[model samples]
Target: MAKSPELDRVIGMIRERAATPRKTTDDDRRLYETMLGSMPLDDDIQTERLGVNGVPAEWIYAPGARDDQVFLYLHGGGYVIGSMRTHRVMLSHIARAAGCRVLGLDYRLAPETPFPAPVEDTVAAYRWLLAHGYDPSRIALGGDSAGGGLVVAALVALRYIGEPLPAAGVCLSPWIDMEATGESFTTNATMDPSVNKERVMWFAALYLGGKNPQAPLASPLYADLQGLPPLLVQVGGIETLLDDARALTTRAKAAGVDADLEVWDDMPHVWQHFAPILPEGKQAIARIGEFLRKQIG
Candidate 1:
């Protein structure tokens, strides 16, 4: 490998798990959300609470962000946990970097909502954005891990019924492959300070073991992959889902979509989630902002 970037203990400690705590249980969910919310919010990044057609949401705006454009952010938690509360500060950084208003949704999570429910909430939220006057050309969708998977699966659902699509999409360590078929799951398994492959598989089972894993709505890796907006997928070079990003981008390109993939060296899954303190996370968020600007402007 080429010269690698430094990894700090802060982000490392969080990514240290082999996988999530594994459950939709109240205690586990609370613990996961608390960990994700550890980053402090900026006072300058304003927030407004609202409902996105019943899906709870918050509009995040940086000091100079424009109202004309929006980035709708879906959060991670493997579809089992994570809420708008856990990711607000991180969204604040994205709003600042992207210079666009950001909307973070609490799309009802699973076990209680299960397969197709979070998908339904996102699809509904996008339509709500359109109905409320946010044009597709001025919008983007993004998230980390499972939410990153949502960026693609939600788009898949939107395109299936000929609904309008966003101008761009972003996936940070996207768990786009429900089957966990990526090679990195084995190659980079030991290096990943976060959850292990077994833990990932556990979350996958929790999300959709009974459901068809290859269903396009659940895993866009098996979808048609055509007639959608441009996408930017970023993953850590040594992370387990490295090939999840690779495979999605490769297939999207084959289907004639411009899916740009960035492999950050030796980083952990969804490193962007730690933007508050990690330099790599901040840099990744900035690149995402730059990419969104170029695509949507």
Candidate 2:
């Protein structure tokens, strides 16, 4: 359970943002950007813009970080909302903590740019890394929510085609089940103030675009998890996606994968977004860094 009052304040802030009813896509996009991008990054962090195989991407790094490895981050926004700008500061924090460079993929969003596109872009980006002298065993791909599921999807897609998978995957409060089948979707409904069942489905329809939600490429929760890399799944104890993270880890372990699931009691969805003020978030990032070091070092 959280002992920090700052967590309470941040929850209230997020609730206020989620309380506002959704309008046009453009308007919601602006609000999402503003909500997460306002935090300033540390002075030691430096970023460079890059185009990863036609996918809009940026590179964030801190002084003295490793040059031989990468932490590819696919941000969470329900596949339609967030961007590199919104996640810049928090990812920079990860870069410094993980002692490696961070590649932020502003993968094409949905309702205009739908499924297969994001997965394709992600796969293509990973290929671009291998093409540019990066080692598959030294790279780790990760994301939050929709992007978290995409993390596994990218791995599944790579495995399907017999490409080398990354060394590890990190999912943050990942929303993977396309049909909202997680019992927590209703069980933890009121506990999670930021996102609820209705809002979650709204995002699902836009991203799925009437495609078979069970398609492994669209929902990694349904994919065969064998031969995938080590997985670190972090989630909030009270969020509706708790079951999503749990089920994913459970399946990964059942498939004989090294999957570790960490449930931070009393936390909400992607609380790492509030790392600027949340010690728990910083601690979680440090944990991620430790995991990466053991896997890649």
lDDT of 2 by residue, 102-156 (tens): 9999899999988888999999899999999999989999899998999998998
Which runs in model 2 stand beyond 4 Å of their true positions?
Answer: 1-3
Candidate 1: stretches off by over 4 Å: 1-6, 15-24
- On TM-score, the candidate that comes out on top is 2
Cα displacement (angstroms), candidate 2, residue 165, comes to 1.4
RMSD of each: 2.4, 1.3
Model 2 clash pairs are none
Worst 10 residues of 1 by lDDT: 1-10
TM-score of 1: 0.93
- Candidate 1 lDDT: 0.83
